[PDB]
Write a structure and sequence with these properties.
Elements: H1 8-23, H2 30-34, H3 37-43, H4 55-63, H5 78-81, H6 83-93, E1 124-133, H7 146-161, E2 169-173, H8 179-187, H9 197-201, E3 213-217, E4 222-226, E5 232-239, H10 243-260, E6 265-266, E7 270-271, E8 284-290, H11 298-306, E9 310-314, E10 318-323, H12 331-351
Antiparallel strand pairs: 1-5, 1-8, 2-3, 3-4, 4-5, 6-7, 8-10, 9-10
Protein name: arginine kinase
Pfam families: ATP-gua_Ptrans, ATP-gua_PtransN
GO molecular function: arginine kinase activity; ATP binding; creatine kinase activity
Length: 352
């Protein structure tokens, strides 16, 4: 498709959408905040080579004015063609990344440099690390054909089915999924279904449930979703606080998948994802930790965690601790911010 010219129908819906955002005087989305009339007028007639327009970017945040973010990338090239809108939204949302920065090449780092965080189990309830990936050579959800979903699933399942040892497990397609399996996966908190209204409006649920499925290892410490928001959502999780083991399992899985399937990647934004909140390392690390002594002063807790760019959220003195930074640092740096921040928080708890 050409870089220029959208048809009259698309132009008309785009104008109607801008007006709807403006008429919404109280709308809080980053879309409303960053799509100025000047940016809109500059990029409204552009297209990617896949034929995606600005409407394929903003429609979800127009249909759902209460979105927090409110745009998605219909294909990898949208991040460039429509960078005038994506850039300010990305650099607003993410911590420590600014226009002109280039996200570093992937580096999981030296796993041996991770210690043991809470061997006794006195503090940390559970530990999770989540990543996402898109498959190189395909558009993203709004542009995928029925044939695309089938081919991506075949490739993903070929990789997952060959996982050995710690990672060995079972793939469950959504296509034909039995009520028995739905019930079992719900109990494990492993099931996804057809997307909510934000994904529906983004045209991310086309040809449902073709190409969609759920994989987990037998120990239920490794989970993969195929074709939900991204081609791959990859999670390592376990009870207790052994961040080294959780991260090592994740690294082993992603490396093994990459040997067969390259991932969509951008020179400045890192790994490309359907929602721009998942860019860079894509890392969403989360530890539930009991800090009842530090709970007497939430501000010193928030402040101490913030020295390592960690976010504190009460869930009772139990907190969800997570990495603020996903872009502009390596995977090793992000997971080490969690390790070092949690180390300081535990020392503070013991000292109080």
């Amino acid at each position: 498709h050409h870089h220029h010219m959208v048809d009259a129908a698309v132009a008309e819906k785009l104008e109607a959408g801008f007006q709807k955002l403006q008429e919404a005087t109280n709308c809080k989305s980053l879309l409303k905040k960053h799509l100025t009339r000047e940016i809109f007028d500059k990029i409204k007639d552009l297209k990617t080579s896949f034929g995606s327009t600005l409407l394929d970017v903003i429609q979800s945040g127009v249909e759902n004015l209460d979105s927090g973010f409110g745009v998605y990338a219909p294909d990898a090239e949208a991040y460039s063609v429509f960078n005038d809108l994506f850039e300010p939204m990305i650099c607003d949302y993410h911590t420590g990344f600014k226009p002109g920065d280039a996200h570093p090449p992937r580096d999981f780092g030296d796993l041996e440099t991770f210690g043991n965080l809470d061997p006794e189990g006195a503090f940390i309830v559970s530990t999770r690390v989540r990543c996402g990936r898109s498959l190189a050579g395909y558009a993203f959800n709004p542009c995928l054909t029925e044939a695309n979903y089938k081919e991506m699933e075949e490739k993903v399942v070929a990789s997952l089915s060959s996982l050995e040892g710690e990672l060995k497990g079972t793939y469950y397609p959504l296509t034909g999924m039995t009520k028995e399996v739905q019930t079992q996966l719900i109990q494990d908190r492993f099931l996804f279904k057809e997307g909510d209204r934000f994904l529906q409006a983004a045209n991310a649920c086309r040809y449902w449930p073709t190409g969609r499925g759920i994989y987990h290892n037998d120990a239920k410490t490794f989970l993969v979703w195929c074709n939900e928001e991204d081609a791959l959502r990859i999670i390592s999780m376990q009870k207790g606080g052994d961040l080294k083991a959780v991260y090592a399992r994740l690294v082993n899985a992603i490396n093994e998948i990459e040997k067969r399937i390259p991932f969509s990647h951008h020179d400045k934004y890192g790994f490309l994802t359907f929602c721009p909140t998942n860019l860079g390392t894509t890392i969403r690390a989360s530890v539930h930790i009991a800090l009842p002594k530090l709970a007497a002063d939430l501000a010193k807790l928030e402040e101490a965690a913030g020295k390592f760019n960690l976010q504190v959220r009460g869930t009772g003195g139990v907190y969800d601790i997570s990495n603020k930074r996903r872009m502009g640092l390596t995977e090793y740096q992000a997971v080490k911010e969690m390790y070092d921040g949690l180390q300081e928080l535990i020392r503070m708890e013991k000292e109080a």
